[PDB]
Design a protein around this motif. Structure first.
Motif, PDB file in Angstrom:
ATOM      1  N   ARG A  26       0.908  -1.205   0.290  1.00 41.65           N
ATOM      2  CA  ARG A  26       0.322   0.132   0.135  1.00 41.65           C
ATOM      3  C   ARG A  26       0.913   1.598  -0.152  1.00 41.65           C
ATOM      4  NH1 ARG A  26      -5.468   1.140   2.860  1.00 41.65           N
ATOM      5  NH2 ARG A  26      -5.030   2.816   3.081  1.00 41.65           N
TER       6      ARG A  26
ATOM      7  N   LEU B 165       5.948  -5.756  14.978  1.00 41.63           N
ATOM      8  CA  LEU B 165       6.698  -5.068  13.556  1.00 41.63           C
ATOM      9  C   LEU B 165       5.339  -3.898  13.479  1.00 41.63           C
ATOM     10  CD1 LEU B 165       7.067  -8.155  12.272  1.00 41.63           C
ATOM     11  CD2 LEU B 165       6.789  -6.566  10.290  1.00 41.63           C
TER      12      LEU B 165
ATOM     13  N   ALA C 197      -0.796   0.367  12.638  1.00 40.15           N
ATOM     14  CA  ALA C 197      -0.734  -0.988  13.214  1.00 40.15           C
ATOM     15  C   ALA C 197       0.272  -1.206  13.557  1.00 40.15           C
ATOM     16  CB  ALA C 197      -1.778  -2.227  12.054  1.00 40.15           C
ATOM     17  N   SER C 198       0.235  -2.374  14.766  1.00 39.82           N
ATOM     18  CA  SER C 198       1.454  -2.870  15.890  1.00 39.82           C
ATOM     19  C   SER C 198       0.909  -4.035  15.806  1.00 39.82           C
ATOM     20  CB  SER C 198       2.093  -1.955  16.981  1.00 39.82           C
ATOM     21  OG  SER C 198       2.419  -2.705  17.703  1.00 39.82           O
TER      22      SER C 198
ATOM     23  N   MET D 238      -1.488 -10.617   6.133  1.00 40.01           N
ATOM     24  CA  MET D 238      -2.266  -9.541   6.476  1.00 40.01           C
ATOM     25  C   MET D 238      -3.477  -8.863   5.567  1.00 40.01           C
ATOM     26  SD  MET D 238       1.644  -7.952   6.314  1.00 40.01           S
ATOM     27  CE  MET D 238       1.076  -7.345   4.562  1.00 40.01           C
TER      28      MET D 238
ATOM     29  N   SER E 289      -7.164  -7.865   6.233  1.00 36.12           N
ATOM     30  CA  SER E 289      -8.009  -7.609   6.764  1.00 36.12           C
ATOM     31  C   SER E 289      -7.237  -8.124   8.229  1.00 36.12           C
ATOM     32  CB  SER E 289      -9.411  -8.234   6.767  1.00 36.12           C
ATOM     33  OG  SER E 289      -9.146  -8.235   5.602  1.00 36.12           O
ATOM     34  N   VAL E 290      -7.238  -9.119   8.610  1.00 36.62           N
ATOM     35  CA  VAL E 290      -6.708  -9.269  10.423  1.00 36.62           C
ATOM     36  C   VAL E 290      -4.886 -10.052   9.755  1.00 36.62           C
ATOM     37  CG1 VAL E 290      -6.829 -11.690  11.868  1.00 36.62           C
ATOM     38  CG2 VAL E 290      -8.917 -10.699  10.918  1.00 36.62           C
ATOM     39  N   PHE E 291      -4.113  -9.979  10.769  1.00 32.16           N
ATOM     40  CA  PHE E 291      -3.227  -9.810  10.845  1.00 32.16           C
ATOM     41  C   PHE E 291      -3.815 -11.786  12.049  1.00 32.16           C
ATOM     42  CE2 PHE E 291       1.789  -8.897  10.348  1.00 32.16           C
ATOM     43  CZ  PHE E 291       2.120 -10.027  11.558  1.00 32.16           C
TER      44      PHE E 291
HETATM   45 CL1  LIG Z   1       2.043  -5.097  12.030  1.00 38.91          CL
HETATM   46  C1  LIG Z   1       0.484  -4.984  11.362  1.00 38.91           C
HETATM   47  C2  LIG Z   1      -1.032  -4.924  12.222  1.00 38.91           C
HETATM   48  C3  LIG Z   1      -2.162  -5.293  11.395  1.00 38.91           C
HETATM   49  C4  LIG Z   1      -1.964  -5.200  10.226  1.00 38.91           C
HETATM   50  C5  LIG Z   1      -3.812  -5.208   9.314  1.00 38.91           C
HETATM   51  C6  LIG Z   1      -4.161  -3.444   8.508  1.00 38.91           C
HETATM   52  C7  LIG Z   1      -3.747  -3.392   7.621  1.00 38.91           C
HETATM   53  C8  LIG Z   1      -3.640  -1.920   6.571  1.00 38.91           C
HETATM   54  C9  LIG Z   1      -3.162  -2.087   5.656  1.00 38.91           C
HETATM   55  C10 LIG Z   1      -3.687  -0.051   5.146  1.00 38.91           C
HETATM   56  C11 LIG Z   1      -3.769   0.490   6.326  1.00 38.91           C
HETATM   57  C12 LIG Z   1      -3.924   0.038   7.467  1.00 38.91           C
HETATM   58  C13 LIG Z   1      -3.976  -1.126   7.907  1.00 38.91           C
HETATM   59  C14 LIG Z   1      -4.487  -0.969   9.219  1.00 38.91           C
HETATM   60  N1  LIG Z   1      -5.072  -0.630  10.559  1.00 38.91           N
HETATM   61  C15 LIG Z   1      -4.832  -1.531  11.190  1.00 38.91           C
HETATM   62  C16 LIG Z   1      -5.159  -2.958  10.835  1.00 38.91           C
HETATM   63  N2  LIG Z   1      -4.379  -3.018   9.634  1.00 38.91           N
HETATM   64  C17 LIG Z   1      -4.840  -6.071   9.634  1.00 38.91           C
HETATM   65  C18 LIG Z   1      -4.129  -6.407   8.707  1.00 38.91           C
HETATM   66  C19 LIG Z   1      -1.185  -4.576   9.149  1.00 38.91           C
HETATM   67  C20 LIG Z   1       0.045  -4.284  10.064  1.00 38.91           C
END
Ligand SMILES: Clc1ccc(C2(c3cc4ccccc4c4nccn34)CC2)cc1
Ligand SMILES: Clc1ccc(C2(c3cc4ccccc4c4nccn34)CC2)cc1
Length: 301
Positions: free
Chosen positions: A25, A38, A50-51, A87, A89-91
């Motif tokens: 992205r 991460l 996100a984390s 990754m 929607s959900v990690f």
């Molecule tokens: Cl370290 C980590 C943790 C969680 C995620 C996700 C995620 C991807 C995303 C993509 C584009 C914009 C915002 C986001 C987002 N915001 C909070 C969740 N996410 C759930 C996959 C990715 C990396």
């Protein structure tokens, strides 16, 4: 090298970014920390999006998949050393390569994972997670201290510990003589050359094409069109690199620039469209009670 953006880790009296890689992205960078987390950052605003705690030891490596569905991580001492995440929607965790301390995706079709355990390489299926191949021959081993097995851009050849392997037939086609202790080498994106430290080899003759003294001990990173090449020399949480990086024309191998940020470098990477270079630089020293890394975004540009 015009600076565009800078930021440190959010809510940390000591910032601990250890490595970085652009996400699929646009406008978002992914960073490993020394607490094995991460983190997704807006690279322009320096906002944390996100984390997630992937490991209980410092991240040493990370690699987003081009479709943004998957991501590889490698830690320091936590078992498992390396893992594959999803990754969408959900990690979440997909697989875990228990003893492999370094991992990469295949390049053309991203369906496989190449892992490194010292001098040995392992290829894995992404879907099933199974060990498909093991590439190792104790007679041809160079024993590079910083060996990283890697696929060529079409995924039919693999370089490991200075040996070129044919994947299809799983036989070692050539072994390159050892002229340093540490660097094991990469494929040129044009898939005709192989850069093993100061030596550029032809894949068609195994003749030496170039000697590039300035490349000694550099971890080499290309731009996405493979016309420019960025090196960070190793040193002789201690950083693996010193305070300077070098740029090279990646077609004729003439030097372009030697930037010295006057701060030890932790990692360095490029976006997909060849406009930007992100760099993790340490404000502390080795002897400092704590790290204090920042991320600097330069346009090149
Ligand atoms: Cl370290 C980590 C943790 C969680 C995620 C996700 C995620 C991807 C995303 C993509 C584009 C914009 C915002 C986001 C987002 N915001 C909070 C969740 N996410 C759930 C996959 C990715 C990396
Ligand atoms: Cl020549 C070479 C090849 C690979 C590496 C690794 C690495 C190790 C590390 C340890 C502590 C903090 C940051 C890092 C880091 N940042 C980007 C890469 N690394 C992948 C292991 C280093 C040198």
């Amino acid at each position: 090298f015009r600076p565009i953006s800078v930021f440190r880790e959010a809510n940390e009296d000591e910032s601990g970014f250890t490595c970085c890689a652009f996400s699929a992205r646009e406008r978002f960078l992914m960073l490993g920390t020394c607490t094995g987390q991460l983190k997704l950052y807006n690279v322009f605003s320096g906002q944390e999006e996100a984390s997630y705690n992937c490991h209980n030891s410092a991240i040493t490596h990370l690699e987003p998949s081009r479709d943004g569905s998957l991501l590889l991580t490698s830690a320091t001492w936590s078992q498992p050393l390396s893992a594959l995440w999803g990754m969408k929607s959900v990690f979440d965790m997909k697989h875990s390569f228990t003893e492999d301390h370094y991992v990469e995706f295949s390049k053309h079709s991203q369906d496989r994972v190449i892992g490194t355990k010292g001098d040995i390489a392992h290829i894995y299926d992404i879907q099933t997670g199974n060990k498909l191949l093991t590439l190792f021959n104790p007679d041809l081993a160079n024993n590079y201290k910083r060996n990283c097995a890697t696929f060529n851009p079409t995924d039919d050849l693999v370089l490991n510990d200075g040996v070129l392997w044919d994947v299809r037939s799983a036989l070692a086609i050539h072994k390159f003589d050892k002229f340093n202790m540490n660097i094991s080498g990469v494929f040129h994106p044009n898939g005709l050359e192989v850069i093993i430290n100061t030596e550029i080899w032809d894949l068609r003759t195994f003749h030496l094409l170039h000697t590039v003294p300035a490349l000694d001990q550099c971890r080499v990173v290309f731009n996405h069109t493979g016309t420019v090449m960025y090196g960070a020399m190793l040193q002789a949480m201690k950083s693996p690199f010193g305070s300077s990086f070098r740029t090279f024309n990646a077609t004729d191998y003439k030097p372009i620039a030697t930037i010295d940020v006057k701060r030890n470098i932790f990692d360095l990477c490029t976006d997909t469209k060849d406009c930007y270079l992100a760099v993790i630089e340490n404000q502390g020293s080795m002897d400092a009670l704590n790290m204090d890394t920042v991320c600097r975004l330069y346009e090149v540009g």
